[PDB]
Design a protein around this ligand. Sequence first.
Ligand SMILES: Nc1ncnc2c1ncn2[C@@H]1O[C@H](COP(=O)(O)OP(=O)(O)OP(=O)(O)O)[C@@H](O)[C@H]1O
Length: 166
Amino acid sequence: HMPLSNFEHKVITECVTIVLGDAIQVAKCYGESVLVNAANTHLKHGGGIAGAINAASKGAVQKESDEYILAKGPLQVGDSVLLQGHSLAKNILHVVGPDARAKQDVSLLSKCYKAMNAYPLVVTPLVSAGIFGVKPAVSFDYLIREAKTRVLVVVNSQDVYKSLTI
Ligand SMILES: Nc1ncnc2c1ncn2[C@@H]1O[C@H](COP(=O)(O)OP(=O)(O)OP(=O)(O)O)[C@@H](O)[C@H]1O
């Protein structure tokens, strides 16, 4: 079974496909992929996809992240950091999308998605599209504008999936 058949998906461009499912699982089918974590300034992976990723890695993502943040200090918004994959992916790219509730610049999503272009295959959720208050459609708009590499954008609500795929 070629990986994406385990999932409902729709190719948008030769670059971007929209997959309905859990991004952790999609990334598990591609060992050469980089998994995008939708993270905060302090890489505190307490919930959302950050907590699911931290939990899949059995706490390891949190401890690596604590060492990095202690050493470098906290990340700005739109910053990204490539860290270990903890066998969930070749690597995890921790991406700090803007927080709309806090009235942060949503065009910083462009900076977040740009970072994904350094990798040949990336599996990502919609950055800032949950508690951070950016509509998934709006997050998807920033992604499709910047994606120059092969990006599997994975949405785990079926409603979001139907909206994105017309
Ligand atoms: N394992 C996951 N895989 C793919 N998409 C996810 C996953 N978990 C959450 N999402 C979706 O991707 C987007 C980014 O998630 P985010 O890191 O901002 O945490 P969250 O959205 O507040 O968590 P939740 O949606 O469960 O309340 C959200 O719209 C969210 O619903």
